From Swiss-Prot, chain A:
Subcellular compartments: Cytoplasm
Record-stated family: Belongs to the eukaryotic ribosomal protein eS32 family.
Protein name per Swiss-Prot or TrEMBL: Small ribosomal subunit protein eS32
Superkingdom of the source species: Eukaryota
Region Disordered, annotated ranges: 1-25
An example Gene Ontology biological process: translation
Name of encoding gene: RPL41
GO molecular function ontology, one term from the record: structural constituent of ribosome
Entry function: Component of the small ribosomal subunit. The ribosome is a large ribonucleoprotein complex responsible for the synthesis of proteins in the cell. Interacts with the beta subunit of protein kinase CKII and stimulates phosphorylation of DNA topoisomerase II alpha by CKII.
This protein's record includes keyword Cytoplasm: yes
Pfam families registered for this protein in UniProt: Ribosomal_L41
Keywords attached to this entry: Cytoplasm, Ribonucleoprotein, Ribosomal protein
InterPro entries noted in UniProt: Ribosomal_eS32
Subunit structure: Component of the small ribosomal subunit.
Curated annotation (Swiss-Prot), chain B:
Main location: cytoplasm
One function term, GO molecular function aspect: structural constituent of ribosome
Function text: Component of the small ribosomal subunit. The ribosome is a large ribonucleoprotein complex responsible for the synthesis of proteins in the cell.
Record-given protein name: Small ribosomal subunit protein eS26
Gene it is expressed from: RPS26
Organism of derivation: Oryctolagus cuniculus
Classification via PANTHER family: 40S RIBOSOMAL PROTEIN S26, SMALL RIBOSOMAL SUBUNIT PROTEIN ES26-RELATED
Keyword vocabulary terms for this entry: Cytoplasm, Endoplasmic reticulum, Phosphoprotein, Ribonucleoprotein, Ribosomal protein, Zinc
From Swiss-Prot, chain F:
Described function: Component of the small ribosomal subunit. The ribosome is a large ribonucleoprotein complex responsible for the synthesis of proteins in the cell. Part of the small subunit (SSU) processome, first precursor of the small eukaryotic ribosomal subunit. During the assembly of the SSU processome in the nucleolus, many ribosome biogenesis factors, an RNA chaperone and ribosomal proteins associate with the nascent pre-rRNA and work in concert to generate RNA folding, modifications, rearrangements and cleavage as well as targeted degradation of pre-ribosomal RNA by the RNA exosome.
Modified sites of kind Phosphothreonine: T118
Primary location group: cytoplasm
Family according to the record: Belongs to the universal ribosomal protein uS11 family.
Listed name of the protein: Small ribosomal subunit protein uS11
UniProt subunit comment: Component of the small ribosomal subunit. Part of the small subunit (SSU) processome, composed of more than 70 proteins and the RNA chaperone small nucleolar RNA (snoRNA) U3.
PROSITE patterns the UniProt entry points to: RIBOSOMAL_S11
Ranges of biased composition (kind: Basic residues): 127-136
Subcellular localization(s) per the UniProt record: Cytoplasm; Nucleus, Nucleolus
Source organism of the structure: Oryctolagus cuniculus (Rabbit)
Curated annotation (Swiss-Prot), chain H:
GO biological process annotation, one example: translation
Covalent cross-link site, Glycyl lysine isopeptide (Lys-Gly) (interchain with G-Cter in SUMO1): K103
Family under the similarity heading: Belongs to the eukaryotic ribosomal protein eS17 family.
Pfam families linked: Ribosomal_S17e (PF00833)
Record's subcellular location: Cytoplasm; Nucleus, Nucleolus
Keyword set, alphabetical order: Cytoplasm, Isopeptide bond, Nucleus, Phosphoprotein, Ribonucleoprotein, Ribosomal protein, Ubl conjugation
Protein name as it appears in the record: Small ribosomal subunit protein eS17
Source organism: Oryctolagus cuniculus (Rabbit)
Record note on quaternary structure: Component of the small ribosomal subunit. Part of the small subunit (SSU) processome, composed of more than 70 proteins and the RNA chaperone small nucleolar RNA (snoRNA) U3.
Phosphoserine, modified sites: S113
Protein purpose: Component of the small ribosomal subunit. The ribosome is a large ribonucleoprotein complex responsible for the synthesis of proteins in the cell. Part of the small subunit (SSU) processome, first precursor of the small eukaryotic ribosomal subunit. During the assembly of the SSU processome in the nucleolus, many ribosome biogenesis factors, an RNA chaperone and ribosomal proteins associate with the nascent pre-rRNA and work in concert to generate RNA folding, modifications, rearrangements and cleavage as well as targeted degradation of pre-ribosomal RNA by the RNA exosome.
Amino acid sequence: MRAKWRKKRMRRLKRKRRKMRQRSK
Amino acid sequence: TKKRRNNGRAKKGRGHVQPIRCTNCACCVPKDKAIKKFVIRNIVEAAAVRDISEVSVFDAYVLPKLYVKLHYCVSCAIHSKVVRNRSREARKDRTPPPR
Amino acid sequence: AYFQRPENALKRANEFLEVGKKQPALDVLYDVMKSKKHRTWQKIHEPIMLKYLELCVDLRKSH
Amino acid sequence: KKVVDPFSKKDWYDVKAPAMFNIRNIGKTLVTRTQGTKIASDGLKGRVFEVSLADLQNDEVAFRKFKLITEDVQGKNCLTNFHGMDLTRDKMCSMVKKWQTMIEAHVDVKTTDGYLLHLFCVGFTKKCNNQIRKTSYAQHQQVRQIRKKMMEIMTREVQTNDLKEVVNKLIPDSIGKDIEKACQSIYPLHDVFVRKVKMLKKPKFELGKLMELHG
Amino acid sequence: RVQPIKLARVTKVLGRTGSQGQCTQVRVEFMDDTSRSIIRNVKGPVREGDVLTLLESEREARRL
Amino acid sequence: SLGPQVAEGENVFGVCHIFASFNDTFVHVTDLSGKETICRVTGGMKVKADRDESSPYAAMLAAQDVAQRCKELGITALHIKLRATGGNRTKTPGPGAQSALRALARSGMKIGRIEDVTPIPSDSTRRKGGRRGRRL
Amino acid sequence: MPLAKDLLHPSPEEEKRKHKKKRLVQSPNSYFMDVKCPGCYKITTVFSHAQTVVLCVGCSTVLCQPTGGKARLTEGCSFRRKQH
Amino acid sequence: MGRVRTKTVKKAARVIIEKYYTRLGNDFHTNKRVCEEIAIIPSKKLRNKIAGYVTHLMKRIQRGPVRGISIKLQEEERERRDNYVPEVSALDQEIIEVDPDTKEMLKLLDFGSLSNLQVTQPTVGM
RNA sequence: CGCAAGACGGACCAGAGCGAAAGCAUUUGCCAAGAAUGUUUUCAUUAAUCAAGAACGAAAGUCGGAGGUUCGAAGACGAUCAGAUACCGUCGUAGUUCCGACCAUAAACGAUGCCGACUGGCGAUGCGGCGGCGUUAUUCCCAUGACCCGCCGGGCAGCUUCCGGGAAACCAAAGUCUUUGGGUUCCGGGGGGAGUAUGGUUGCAAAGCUGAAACUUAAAGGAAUUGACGGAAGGGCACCACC
């Protein structure tokens, strides 16, 4: 199911990027 | 490309149809996709009947039938040889096998 | 099956008469006089017909 | 228990049926003979026997089963009474088939005696002898009209009778034959039976009424 | 516990069985009561009307 | 031993319960009410490896062991009740079912009526193995 | 239909077979009839697809009953159509 | 093993029987001599195989027709089933019954007057 | 043999019915709603399709109460194996059931907007109406139920054909198109980067909606034909195969 797993991989990367940027200011 | 005109299912004029669990593997599939087989047999085999009729206490008795209804998914029906694959024109025949 | 031996026709008709119903005590005895399985004559056909004609007289069923 | 030959300590007893049935001997059964605080009759009472009607009546009908209970022990005899009736598994499996309607009903009722009974009834639609169509289905209002007639006839026969007259109707099953006659004006029916009876409650022990069913 | 030897006569040969075709499948009729018959599997070369020796009569076998 | 003191011209009946599945088979004979046990023997008492416990041969050997103990205790005829596992599961009898029945006939017991007794739900709790089934 | 049947002259058995709105010119299947009963004999007029439980001038309790199609008469002496 | 006969044998045997039916018979040793003088055959071993199938075909032709072979003796009795049979001296006679709707069809065609009549069942047979 | 608790409605069950879709199967009663048909009832253009705005919306998931039979993410162990954080087995938390608030997604599929007209044949099937010779049931007719033979509406579908269309597979519509115009809503423009970054907005959270560019590339893709190949199926053969 590679497209469903590429979608899951992007969601966890975006959750990391969310928490990283919103801490800065 | 589309393989079957009926999508491999009986559903026309409906949204949802309830599932059933298979008699071999307990996989979950729709009641109208499942492959049916109703089996009627004697409790005593055609070899054994004579040995069990002569020890009977009664002057007349008739040995009972056993009734079972079976449900398969496509993978179990193919692997257990209940159904075979067919030629592109032969797939259209809806009549059951000869006796 | 329907009747396994024609003797067990009377052993049925006697039970509807014990319950007090005469119509279903006929029909049993009618088919047993009218089925190809029991067309060879036997001592039990007299007791059958002697019960049958008593019921046809008492219910006044001439046909 | 690790007894050496416990079958040396067992007494055989006879089992006797109610006086309605044409053959009155059921068979034989075991119990351990009496010891301090453990009497043999307390082990024999309350046992259930299930018997084919063809062994109570010496016909071939075979497919009705009757249940009997032990109530008291007299000498080497155990005395029994009615507890229910049922149809054999292979009979009911042979009736339910495709392209037909199946109709069922049930009631709770009392006799003129104190017994409370629960009854179940079944019937199936009939293929007419000229029919060229493949299916014999009834419409929903025809099914509702038939079910009211099943309950109406089935309650009428129990309310005004005792357990003696109730069992005399169940032996030939005149109940199912009267339902089958009445419904032919709504939709013809081809198999019709009282398929099960359960007993829910019963009166005091009453030894005189027990012996009236045995003398 | 113990049971006796039985003798039986071959009345028909039915085919060959086993992974390499090693065993013949055969019908036999007993030497005492000539109304009885069963089917058996046999290891060697077999011909119609041979007499076999059975160490048990009660066992019967289909297609291994 | 002691059966009934009558021993000529008529039969003494028991009930035989045969429970035949995959994995094992039971042969178990009782009093006519079902409350007292006379004897019980199983496929796993006759063989010495787990593959063989459901076999036709183990079931024949268990039935011959039961029928000798019946005659020794004075029973002469049997009613038969047959089971497969039932409930959510397969409800077809296991492979040892046919062999036990003929083996108690061939060893001299008289045969009464025979019944199928497997338990069937009107509808049931959820069956084991998940939505994708057991996969092999 | 063949390739050449003319549309201006349908036979009366071709016209009587088809739906009331799909004829060449429209016409109803319903009609008026005159009805009469025992005990009081004043004749009255009724419509064959009536919705009303009609009471006659003779004051009998039912002349006809309504139904999903034609109304049914209570065994009255006439079902005769009026001609026009 | 395999004893099936190839088309070189089967075609040569048919052509011999079409031309020389009056010379042939059931004796292999006489057929073997006839086939050597009416035909050029390159090998003794091929001559024996041709006379063998000719001997098989003669024993079939004594019972009935063989679809690939024709002879005057069998054609002239076919020509006697052709033409007219000994069966009857006149046709099956026109005195036959009529159903009421055929009587009405003939009435509109200005005909009838020579047929008996009866009606069918009350409702369509099932 | 008898008691208790929580979940579920087998067989009958079908290319059958109902609903805007998601969905809907034990009995009996109560409340409000609806399609088609019948009609020589009545109003008289009141209609079609839709930015903004609004109701409903499988399963999983979140918050607060009650319950907990069966099954079972995470987790603890037994096997298998080079390893096995998996497939197979034993046990089990959250959840799976009910009540009250949230959430707005799906291969949510006929991968196929809605309204209207026209263009071949045939046999069935569910509902309402119309006509007809017999058989069967209740009361003695009549009326009415079960069956049988036709006709008319509108419904879920099937078979057939050189209607015609198409790249073909196939389609009575996916037809009436270079002989190109019945009305009207949404929406695509070679393959990737990408449903990503950034701003707005809704949410308790998970997340939903809206949504780029720099840069990179000669093909990526659809339908069908002949080979080769399969731990796919069916026949047949060989001591350079096996018994």
